[PDB]
Point group: D2
Chain length 194, copies 4
Amino acid sequence: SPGVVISDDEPGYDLDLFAIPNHYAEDLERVFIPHGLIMDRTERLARDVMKEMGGHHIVALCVLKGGYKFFADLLDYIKALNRNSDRSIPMTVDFIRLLSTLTGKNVLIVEDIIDTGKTMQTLLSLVRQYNPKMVKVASLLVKRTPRSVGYKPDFVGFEIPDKFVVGYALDYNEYFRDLNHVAVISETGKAKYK
Amino acid sequence: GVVISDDEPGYDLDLFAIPNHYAEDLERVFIPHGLIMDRTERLARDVMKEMGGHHIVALCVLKGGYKFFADLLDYIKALNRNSDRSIPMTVDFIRLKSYSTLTGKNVLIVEDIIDTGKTMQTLLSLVRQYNPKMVKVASLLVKRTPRSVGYKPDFVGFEIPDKFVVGYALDYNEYFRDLNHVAVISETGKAKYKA
Amino acid sequence: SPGVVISDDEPGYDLDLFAIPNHYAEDLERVFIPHGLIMDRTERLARDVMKEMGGHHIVALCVLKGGYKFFADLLDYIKALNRNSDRSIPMTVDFIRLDLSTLTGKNVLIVEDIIDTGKTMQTLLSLVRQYNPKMVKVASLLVKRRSVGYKPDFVGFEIPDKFVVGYALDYNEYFRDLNHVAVISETGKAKYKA
Amino acid sequence: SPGVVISDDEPGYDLDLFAIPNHYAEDLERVFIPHGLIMDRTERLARDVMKEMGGHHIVALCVLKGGYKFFADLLDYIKALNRNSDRSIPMTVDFIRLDDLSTLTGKNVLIVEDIIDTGKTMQTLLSLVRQYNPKMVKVASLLVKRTPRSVGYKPDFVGFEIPDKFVVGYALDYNEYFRDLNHVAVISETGKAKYKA
Ligand SMILES: O=c1[nH]cnc2c1ncn2C[C@@H](CO)OCCP(=O)(O)O
Ligand SMILES: O=c1[nH]cnc2c1ncn2C[C@@H](CO)OCCP(=O)(O)O
Ligand SMILES: O=c1[nH]cnc2c1ncn2C[C@@H](CO)OCCP(=O)(O)O
Ligand SMILES: O=c1[nH]cnc2c1ncn2C[C@@H](CO)OCCP(=O)(O)O
Ligand SMILES: [Mg+2]
Ligand SMILES: [Mg+2]
Ligand SMILES: [Mg+2]
Ligand SMILES: [Mg+2]
């Protein structure tokens, strides 16, 4: 599964159709991925994670700051799956930004976005040193870009065209993290926070 | 409302937490459950802006509208307990045909879908007989169809193509109501569950 | 299960500690059962239901008006369990208020807001069972504490002999637009008295 | 206000009454604070926080690890407030384990903690943060213990005032375990030894 394939000609949604914070009212252009759609895809990704990794103790590794929202919501759906099934597995958590406890564990890396792939392969190479039982990477967004070194994560929320997006903890110079939707910035917004 | 164009491909069923047996029946997911909620949250703010100045009587049109009704009212309630402006609401449920607690009240009619539009016009004419302050209609869906009488609701979630949809309490021959997403039913599906 | 037992000495919670609609600010006295506790209890009920009734086609009967929100929340949890079991059984819904020939030979779940004297439920049971379903089960969110002698198959909370409002339960059709189960104040009682 | 006061007499809730992860079925004893009750209190805290700190740019500071759940849920409710109004304020976030702290200067800083016991962890952190001269600094703590061993600090925002017992769940841990639990619960003796370091 390459994830939800969002087309190159995807226009997004008009801001007036959704609830968005007033302080970003002119800094955004379009709602690109609605927060609810993210939840729906995340609920499905949780089931996939549970089918590949639920056979042994999982350590969910959050990649701060961008991934913390996807991380929290993904773990929620996994916990929901685990208190309503008789098939369940314990989970511990850790956080990192760009550790001997990962050895012999099923390590799940939770990331916000993969672009060139450099961040993750750096992260993976570091993790593999401590010899886990398996390493899987869940990435909310994967871009179609020629700058890609060729890396693909194991779990994908949305596959998107090479366009700069913000929201759902993804930032533009630390701004737009306080935004539930994933959106594209206006010409005003970029200038304002550059 | 959110305009879903005719050439909209939709989403593959495999992309969401949906049982795979709904594959032969149905076709694609057109409106994910989460997309409904986000739109619905907005509609709650719109409703509370236009009809917030007077006691609202929320009128649920069973059966197809009960989920949209439930969700829209949760978002209204969330607004009412987290801001300065709020208004009391009462609720009521109705169903329509086959083949006075509204007097001086702000009546909000909550419908699942508007096709030709004369279901609402007939309903709208029965109300306003008992002289309310205002009647407004919130419909989750509106179809683009050449069979439309020209009626347009005051609150629209999504404007969809002329294809038969199911899910989110919407049905085809009393089927597929428990589906959490709005999807298009296939021709084979239609014949399969045809009465 | 007698459900979550709520003793008569329980004072509930202060209104200033929770989010309350401003038009019921002095109409209420104490929060009795927080909305989230209702959800947490309801989530458990859904699995108890599916453990007993989940072996056959389920027809959920919603008793309007007071039960509609308990019905909707209970159903979402049941629908969630249904699609998670990888064995989705037919689940159809219906509504009654105080031609249901579609109850024959199926598992009928009656969903009600509150049981006191039990006369409401006795009346509804005689009508339904005059259609011969496979089984009749009654899920009631609230049961008050020697009247007649009836016990629901599924109970959310066992509450004292006290008039409560909220979560679609009403006082003269008011307080329905409230998420918490709360206790009405003296000023509120006289305000909405018939 | 000391938040939702939970009496020392509290028996809690039986585990069979709620939905709990089966791998903790014997490791817990009683459900102490239901997850849904936590949410409802957090929704109220969000408006209390916003009503006091919404006047200027807010920097939300999450105290890892146990602060992660409270932090995510609190900011969710905050976001709902900021998009349901005519007036709202921009917010930036950061995560600390106990950015250049000069980013706190001139800002309304919100410290989000999971639990306060002696109060020393928060007192020391407060003293440090105040040196960078923020516009204001407030502390939000989900749980506050009624303990003899308290230095005497009390947060600006408090979810629950719990008795001097050891609880887990909703990001609060016992030797890194029970973070995958939504409810706040009391750990059993069986689970106390099962994951004992
Ligand atoms: O669309 C975006 N929005 C916000 N930030 C973005 C975006 N793309 C890239 N970044 C920068 C960075 C985020 O931490 O991604 C690096 C991923 P890589 O190492 O190239 O594979
Ligand atoms: O696409 C659909 N899905 C499910 N039901 C549908 C659909 N279209 C029609 N109905 C029947 C009914 C729903 O209440 O609509 C009639 C309204 P109208 O008088 O034509 O404006
Ligand atoms: O605590 C309450 N709040 C609001 N209404 C209440 C309450 N108790 C009773 N009712 C009346 C009615 C609600 O539909 O329930 C009757 C049940 P019964 O026939 O006595 O077994
Ligand atoms: O009940 C608990 N469960 C899990 N962990 C706990 C608990 N109490 C304390 N901690 C550890 C730690 C929380 O970060 O306490 C430091 C706060 P203090 O300086 O003592 O006021
Ligand atoms: Mg990243
Ligand atoms: Mg209809
Ligand atoms: Mg009733
Ligand atoms: Mg801490």
